[PDB]
RNA sequence: CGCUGAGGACUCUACCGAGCGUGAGGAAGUGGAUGACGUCAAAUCAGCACGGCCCUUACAUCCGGGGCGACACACGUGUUACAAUGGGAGGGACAAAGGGCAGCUACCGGGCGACCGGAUGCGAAUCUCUAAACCCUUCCCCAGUUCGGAUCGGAGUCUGCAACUCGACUCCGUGAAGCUGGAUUCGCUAGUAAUCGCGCAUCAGCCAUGGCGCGGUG
RNA sequence: GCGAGGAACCUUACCCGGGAUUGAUGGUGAAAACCGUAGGUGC
């Protein structure tokens, strides 16, 4: 009758703080850090014709897993 | 811009949503019956535009805006999670 | 010699059969396999029976040589005289498979 | 970020909804935005805020062209302090748009 | 205009007789490039 | 940069020659060409010598001495590089069935003291001796 | 017993387990001559043993993942050199004299925007 | 070409007009904009004025035209 | 399988090159981002705003069919080739990043194939999409060829209401110019050039040989 | 191989015509639509 908790967010400090709060709040396995999912967006710097000059933006998703035996905005939970 | 284009897009979306008969005909053969439907009811006439400026090019499905609008909000810190590399 | 065509006598079957108008590499391989002749045999090494088998497979199918030439000419004449878009493109000498001119022939 | 909600792979609708006075999902002097909007409103009603900010370490106030109704466009720096919060405001005067960019380093 | 002349020779003048003022400028450039 | 010993002979000159010979990063192909060429060399001039010794003697024969920048001395590294490049280039230019055969023919000719690479070296020597006054 | 070591080269990773024996080098549950059917690759892998004269004295089990054949062979060579150093610390100067223990950090450069490749540029004209 | 499982694509209204003319037995000219409609054996013997963008090019359908689209006989571009 | 339990791999925390030079011992900087003040009345009123001016029986607005894809030609940027360091046939081996809900599809059955029909798992470190250059054996033996694959004919498969103008892919047939290219001209300096394949954005489908990334050999 | 990182219709601004304002079943029709039961991608 174990419980699986999956936490996703876009700020690593936020995920770590939320996981620590959930752990502190009588047998819970350590938070397993799943591989981070990163996306890169390349956009044109200029609104008109300048193809060479480009800007790069990043969006990261951090995932933690909690196995329990025996919420700040921006964090999605998958309690099951 | 050209608000008539946005009105056209909204009308096309409404006509496409108003769907089940087309799905049933496609599941069957019934191509002669599919010929009878209005052309604006077909989903191929739906074109993705920026949700605020109506720009028909440089679309981004993840955020629903053009590249220029995306760059503006990413620099302004309005899209959560997105940061400059 | 085979269908009125003299083949290269020193070439393998699966290559030398492509010298007939109407047979390529794929058709040559298929013809040899259906006739039961190994494809890596030189033309000069074909037995009389094997040559007969190849000729009989060429017949009854595989419109080749003068028949194919006449068929292609008839198709082109019909296309031109029907006065379709492709017909006028062939009559005037321009690409008709969607290719764009002003840059290439 | 001015928006705080997890919206992975589904940002669009929520972004559109979020887009749809001294104003700065589950001390007006040292505030950049209020300074810029106050300057813009004063310019509508017809820069030297640099002294008002300066316990600010530094403050820069750039004002764009079409100044004072002149035909040409001119940009001025109005640097002060030891500049090494950024706000942008737009004023709709009788001759067009004026851009006021305020940098404040505290 | 712009002469090919291996290395470029570009000039531009704005007037009603640009086709002649540009030629004057380019004559100056060609003489200076002679030696 | 570091140079790996040759797998067969344990030499760096062999690896450098293969590096000059290689196209588009196909070092296995270049090695196969070189080893094959050595095989025809040893099968043809079979000479009270070795297979690699003939190749080394050919490189030494077609190496140049001075180079007109006015004539001046040549560094050993540039000497070796230009010798290898000349051998490979004239082997490519000359006719033949396979690259291994062409290279073997050119190596044998260079050892036997005549060939296009030797003609190039002799011409460079003549052009060098032409300007002895300005030196 | 077992001596553990790891080598890395480009995208290749080699984990080497070394033990007493004679000559069995087994890669991914395959013989060395069957996994690397090239004299150059076999020589690259078995280089440090031939340098230190330790060949015909060990069994090696190798787990390779990632990269191509040359990267994998170089990673295996590095892992074997590190394992030999762990087994006997007095052979470190001999292995350093050939560079078998230096980690080569060369990796594929990222492609840059506005360019066809990492450094190659478009034809300006 | 068109998949054989869907059959041929023929404009239903235009075909209905053609069969109505066939049943009547009269002769006239049928004005159409259906350039993509395939020519069927029922079309033979009639005159169909096909739109090309700014005029109606008249086509007299013969047996060799069966299987061709109506737009192949009404060119849209003028060159000289 | 029970387990691994930290040898890798994941994330998150702490670190590590210290010099007139050399030097030993030790694993031993590069790429990108950020551009003070000046210049081009440089580019964008068709991304978005915005002063002025000009349109209301029309420069506003809905629809169908055309066009943006035409070709005497010229210029620019690329992709294939002109072959032996190569082209076919058969077999063996090695990646990384990234994508996936009407989507990727295990596994069966049909078709030469593009694909189709049942069925399974997966909103996914769990289930799926991912190699080629390379190696081995063999043929072609210097030819406009077993090089090249443009053009054209036929038959199909998908998407879509619809593939004529004007789609992609598949299977037959046909098989052109091209024998390494003058004056001139461009890029790059190490995991780089060169070469090989893989993935993504937009996207019903796709003219994707373009753009943005990844690894292999080097 | 620049806006364009997806022009068959749509996109689409351009052209030719068919309409409409000045902001439930039938018949006809290519559709829009018809008949009965502010805005401007204009300067
Ligand atoms: K579309």
UniProtKB/Swiss-Prot annotation, chain A:
GO (cellular component) term, any one: ribosome
GO biological processes: translation
Single Gene Ontology MF annotation: tRNA binding
Name recorded for this polypeptide: Small ribosomal subunit protein uS10
Classification via SMART domains: Ribosomal_S10 (SM01403)
Family: Belongs to the universal ribosomal protein uS10 family.
Cited function: Involved in the binding of tRNA to the ribosomes.
SUBUNIT field: Part of the 30S ribosomal subunit.
Alphabetical UniProt keywords: Ribonucleoprotein, Ribosomal protein
Keyword Ribosomal protein: yes
UniProtKB/Swiss-Prot annotation, chain D:
Signal peptide (from-to): none
Quaternary structure, from the entry: Part of the 30S ribosomal subunit. Forms a tight complex with proteins S10 and S14.
Role description: Binds the lower part of the 30S subunit head. Binds mRNA in the 70S ribosome, positioning it for translation.
Family note: Belongs to the universal ribosomal protein uS3 family.
Protein name, per record: Small ribosomal subunit protein uS3
The organism of origin for this protein: Porphyromonas gingivalis (strain ATCC 33277 / DSM 20709 / CIP 103683 / JCM 12257 / NCTC 11834 / 2561)
Lineage: Bacteria, Pseudomonadati, Bacteroidota, Bacteroidia, Bacteroidales
Interval of the full protein contained in this chain: 18 to 203 of 246
UniProtKB/Swiss-Prot annotation, chain F:
Family matches, as Gene3D superfamilies: Ribosomal protein S7 domain
Claim: Ribosomal protein is one of the keywords in the record: yes
SUPFAM superfamilies: Ribosomal protein S7 (SSF47973)
Transmembrane intervals: none
The keyword Acetylation is assigned to this record: no
GO biological process assignments: translation
Keywords: Ribonucleoprotein, Ribosomal protein, RNA-binding, rRNA-binding, tRNA-binding
Subunit structure: Part of the 30S ribosomal subunit. Contacts proteins S9 and S11.
Function recorded in the entry: One of the primary rRNA binding proteins, it binds directly to 16S rRNA where it nucleates assembly of the head domain of the 30S subunit. Is located at the subunit interface close to the decoding center, probably blocks exit of the E-site tRNA.
NCBIfam families recorded: rpsG_bact (TIGR01029)
Protein family according to the UniProt entry: Belongs to the universal ribosomal protein uS7 family.
Descriptive protein name: Small ribosomal subunit protein uS7
Species assigned in the record: Porphyromonas gingivalis (strain ATCC BAA-308 / W83)
From Swiss-Prot, chain H:
GO molecular function: rRNA binding; structural constituent of ribosome
Signal peptide: none
GO biological process: ribosomal small subunit assembly; translation
UniProt KW rRNA-binding keyword: yes
Gene Ontology cellular component list: cytoplasm; small ribosomal subunit
Any Pfam family hit: Ribosomal_S19
InterPro entries (UniProt xref): Ribosomal_uS19, Ribosomal_uS19_bac-type, Ribosomal_uS19_CS, Ribosomal_uS19_SF
Keywords from the named record: Ribonucleoprotein, Ribosomal protein, RNA-binding, rRNA-binding
NCBIfam families: rpsS_bact
Reported function: Protein S19 forms a complex with S13 that binds strongly to the 16S ribosomal RNA.
PANTHER family, alphabetized: RIBOSOMAL PROTEIN S19P FAMILY MEMBER, SMALL RIBOSOMAL SUBUNIT PROTEIN US19M
Similarity-based family: Belongs to the universal ribosomal protein uS19 family.
Name of this protein: Small ribosomal subunit protein uS19
Gene source species: Porphyromonas gingivalis (strain ATCC 33277 / DSM 20709 / CIP 103683 / JCM 12257 / NCTC 11834 / 2561)
């Amino acid at each position: 009758q174990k419980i699986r908790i999956k936490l996703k967010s876009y700020d690593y400090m936020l995920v770590d703080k939320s996981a620590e709060k959930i752990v502190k709040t009588a047998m819970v396995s350590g938070p397993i850090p799943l591989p981070t999912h990163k996306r890169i967006f390349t956009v044109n710097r200029s609104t008109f014709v300048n193809k060479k000059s480009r800007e790069q933006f990043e969006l990261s998703s951090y995932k933690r897993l909690i196995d329990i035996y025996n919420l700040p905005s921006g964090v999605e939970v998958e309690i099951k | 811009a050209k608000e008539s284009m946005k009105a056209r897009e909204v009308k096309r979306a409404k006509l496409v949503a108003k769907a089940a008969k087309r799905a049933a005909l496609k599941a069957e053969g019934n191509y002669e019956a599919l010929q009878l439907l209005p052309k604006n009811a077909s989903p191929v006439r739906l074109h993705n535009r920026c949700s605020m400026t109506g720009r028909p090019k440089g679309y981004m499905r993840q955020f629903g805006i053009s590249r220029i609008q995306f760059r503006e909000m990413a620099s302004a810190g309005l899209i959560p999670g997105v940061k400059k590399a | 010699r085979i269908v009125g065509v003299d083949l290269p006598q020193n070439k393998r079957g699966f290559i030398a059969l492509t010298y007939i108008y109407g047979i390529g590499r794929s058709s040559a391989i298929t013809i040899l396999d259906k006739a039961g002749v190994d494809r890596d045999i030189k033309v000069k090494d074909w037995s009389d029976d094997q040559a007969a088998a190849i000729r009989d497979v060429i017949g009854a199918g595989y419109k080749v040589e003068g028949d194919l030439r006449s068929e292609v000419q008839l198709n082109i004449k019909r296309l031109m005289d029907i006065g379709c878009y492709r017909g006028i493109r062939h009559r005037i000498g321009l690409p008709l498979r969607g290719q764009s001119t002003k840059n290439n022939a | 970020w001015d928006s705080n909600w997890y919206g992975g792979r589904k940002y669009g609708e929520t972004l559109l909804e979020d887009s749809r006075a001294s104003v700065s999902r589950a001390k007006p002097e040292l505030d950049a935005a209020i300074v810029a909007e106050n300057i813009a409103r004063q310019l509508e009603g017809k820069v030297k805020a640099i002294a008002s900010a300066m316990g600010a370490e530094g403050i820069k106030i750039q004002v764009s062209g079409r100044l004072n109704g002149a035909e040409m466009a001119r940009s001025e720096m109005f640097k002060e302090g030891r500049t090494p919060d950024y706000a942008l405001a737009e004023a709709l005067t009788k001759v067009g748009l004026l851009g006021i960019k305020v940098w404040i380093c505290k | 205009d712009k002469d090919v002349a291996r290395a470029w020779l570009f000039s531009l003048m704005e007037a009603g007789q640009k086709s002649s003022s540009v030629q004057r400028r380019l004559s100056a450039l060609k003489s200076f490039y002679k030696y | 940069r570091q140079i790996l010993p040759d797998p067969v002979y344990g030499d760096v000159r062999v690896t450098k020659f293969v590096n000059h010979l290689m196209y588009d990063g196909k070092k296995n192909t270049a090695f196969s060409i070189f080893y094959g060429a050595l095989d025809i060399v040893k099968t043809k001039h079979s000479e009270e010598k070795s297979a690699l010794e003939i190749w080394k003697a050919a490189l030494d024969n077609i190496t140049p001495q001075v180079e007109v920048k006015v004539p001046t001395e040549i560094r050993p590294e540039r000497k070796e590089s230009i010798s290898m490049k000349n051998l490979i280039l004239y082997a490519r230019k000359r006719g033949g069935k396979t690259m291994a055969d062409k290279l073997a023919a050119e190596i044998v000719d260079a050892f036997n003291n005549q060939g296009a690479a030797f003609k190039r070296k002799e011409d460079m020597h003549r052009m060098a001796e032409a300007n002895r006054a300005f030196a | 017993d077992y001596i553990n070591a790891i080598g890395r080269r480009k995208a290749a990773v080699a984990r080497v387990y070394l033990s007493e024996g004679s000559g069995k080098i087994v890669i991914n549950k395959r013989e060395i001559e069957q996994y690397f059917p090239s004299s150059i690759l076999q020589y690259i892998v078995k280089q440090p043993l031939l340098k230190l004269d330790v060949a015909a004295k060990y069994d090696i089990k190798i787990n390779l993942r990632g990269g191509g054949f040359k990267g994998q062979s170089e990673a295996a060579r590095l892992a074997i050199a590190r394992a030999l150093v762990k087994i006997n610390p007095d052979d470190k100067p001999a292995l350093r004299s050939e560079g078998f223990i230096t980690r080569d950090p060369r990796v594929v450069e990222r492609k840059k925007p506005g360019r066809p490749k990492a450094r190659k540029r478009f034809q300006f004209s | 070409s068109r998949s054989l499982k869907k059959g041929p694509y023929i404009n239903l209204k235009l075909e209905k007009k053609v069969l109505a003319m066939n049943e009547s037995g009269k002769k006239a000219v049928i004005k159409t904009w259906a350039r993509a409609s395939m020519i069927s054996p029922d079309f033979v013997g009639h005159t169909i004025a096909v739109h090309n963008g700014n005029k109606f090019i008249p086509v007299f359908v013969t047996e060799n035209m069966v299987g061709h689209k109506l737009g192949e006989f009404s060119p849209t571009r003028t060159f000289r």
